[PDB]
């Protein structure tokens, strides 16, 4: 496992990662309390199915919940009220075990952190800042979903729970709590939720102090029209937005720019993700997934979340193509271990091992075929990835003496390698 700074210096980790999404979002409806158990157990699985690194659920204790019709949900992690971990994915204990066996198995942890906001109405917690201190969001005049001056990015739906994060304060609260997560739970790096809510140079700032070496990912959910008309922004593609912030944060960020191409375009359009950006300064940065705990489907009830939700029919395509290509994946709990995508996903995790793929790798595509046709150069070998595609032989794009590594869904997915 390679471990160093991408050229610009953005929090890679050698770019030679590929992360499972430790979670679905119906788990604590479903294994509650028992998650972290079912981790600890499963720890040598994953490591065996070839992961490098594991995205954990958030750890601070989350005892919400809410309703509006049909709709249930709390609890998951994304309205924490303190960072106790007895919450409910299991105890304090169980997560430094679940977390001990991971590492020991060689799969760094990278656990998920909510700064924006917090359970501020919560009746029992540890942590309570008080009002007019400057702690809140509401502490300043709040015109509307837009920076204040207690809150230098957007708010998470009314900003009521939106904390100050450049407060000294709550800066330094979040910084030894990251700290303590690096020297005790044994954290590898940091997903950071809701980026858009709180400035892009804090995430560096809390990495340069707590785990400047470790991995970390921020996920940026916010489409031009989102932005004010006047911003450029407004007006910009999705691939620069989400690049804009990894140059600030000196992070890797997640491929909004490839999730909306999915959902969207063809699969022709695939090649549209920052992933498959020519400059490898840009394509290196990515972080691929084909659907997560909010825009996928979940087990159990109400089909979990599915806010914008791939469709069954291309969740082979999706998989092979960011399996094989530039940027760093990340696979679904839910493809991998519940809906029967674990047999194709590792044996796609083993050509992208084989083939020396990694995050700066060369993609091209040929415009000649129908579907996606790409040549990857991996540093042992090269692939021809051919999705719904007439493509006949791969000796029609590349140059070389190929093998087929994978052939999935009556030909709609093909994989060779020199
Ligand atoms: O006090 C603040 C607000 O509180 C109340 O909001 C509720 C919402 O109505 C619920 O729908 C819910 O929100 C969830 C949300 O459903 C879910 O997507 C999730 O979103 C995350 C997501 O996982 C993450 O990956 C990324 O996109 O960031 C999101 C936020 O972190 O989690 C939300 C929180 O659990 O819960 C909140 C609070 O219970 C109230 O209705 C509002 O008026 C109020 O302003
Ligand atoms: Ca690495
Ligand atoms: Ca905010």
Same mark, same amino acid.
């Given at each position: ?20 999404? @430790? ?29 490098? +690194? ?7 204790? &989350?005892? #919400? ?30 997560? $430094?075990?679940? +977390?001990? +066996?991971?590492?020991? *198995? ?66 330094? /609260?979040? %910084? ?8 005790? =739970? @044994? ?11 709180? *400035? ?6 809390? /990495? ?24 450029? $922004? ?26 909306? %191409? ?10 549209? @993700?920052?992933?498959?950006?020519? &400059?490898? $300064? ?14 996928? =489907?979940?087990?159990? !009830? ?29 696979? =679904?709990?839910?493809? /991998? ?15 992208? %091992? *084989? *083939?020396?793929?990694?995050?700066? #790798? ?18 042992? !070998? ?22 087929? +590594? ?13």
């Amino acid at each position: 496992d390679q471990a160093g700074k991408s050229p610009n210096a953005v929090r890679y980790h050698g770019g030679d990662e590929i992360i499972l999404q @430790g979670f679905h979002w119906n788990v604590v409806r479903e294994a509650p309390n028992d998650w972290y158990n079912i981790l600890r157990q499963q720890a040598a699985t994953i490591a065996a199915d070839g992961f490098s +690194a594991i995205w954990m659920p958030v750890p601070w204790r &989350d005892f #919400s919940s809410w309703s509006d019709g049909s709709k249930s949900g709390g609890g998951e992690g994304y309205f924490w009220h303190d960072f106790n971990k007895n919450g409910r994915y299991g105890s304090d204990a169980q997560l $430094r075990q679940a +977390a001990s +066996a991971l590492g020991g *198995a060689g799969v760094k942890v990278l656990y998920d952190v909510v700064p924006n906001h917090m359970n501020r109405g919560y009746p029992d917690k540890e942590i309570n800042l008080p009002a007019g201190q400057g702690f809140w969001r509401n502490d300043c005049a709040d015109p509307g979903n837009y920076p204040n001056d207690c809150d230098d990015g957007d708010r998470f739906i009314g900003g009521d729970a939106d904390l100050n994060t450049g407060h000294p304060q709550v800066y330094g /609260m979040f %910084r030894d709590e990251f700290t303590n997560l690096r020297s005790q =739970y @044994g954290a590898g790096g940091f997903r950071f939720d809701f980026v858009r809510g709180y *400035a892009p140079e804090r995430v560096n700032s809390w /990495m340069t102090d707590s785990a400047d070496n470790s991995f970390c990912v921020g996920e940026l959910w916010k489409g031009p029209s989102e932005y004010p008309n006047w911003d450029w $922004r407004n007006t910009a593609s999705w691939q620069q937005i989400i690049k804009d912030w990894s140059d600030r944060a000196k992070c890797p960020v997640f491929d909004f720019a490839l999730k909306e %191409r999915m959902q969207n375009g063809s699969i022709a359009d695939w090649k549209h @993700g920052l992933n498959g950006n020519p &400059d490898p $300064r840009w394509r290196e940065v990515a972080v691929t997934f084909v659907d997560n705990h909010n825009t996928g =489907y979940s087990p159990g !009830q109400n089909g979990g979340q599915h806010h914008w939700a791939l469709q069954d029919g291309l969740i082979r395509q999706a998989y092979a193509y960011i399996l094989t290509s530039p940027g760093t994946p990340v696979v =679904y709990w839910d493809h /991998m271990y519940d809906w029967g995508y674990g047999d194709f996903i590792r044996q796609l995790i083993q050509v992208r %091992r *084989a *083939a020396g793929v990694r995050a700066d #790798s060369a993609i091209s595509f040929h415009s000649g075929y129908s579907g996606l046709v790409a040549t990857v150069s991996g540093s042992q !070998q090269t692939l021809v990835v051919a999705l719904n595609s007439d493509l006949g032989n791969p000796g029609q794009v590349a140059s070389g003496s190929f093998s087929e +590594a994978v052939n999935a869904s009556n030909g709609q997915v093909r994989v060779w390698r020199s």
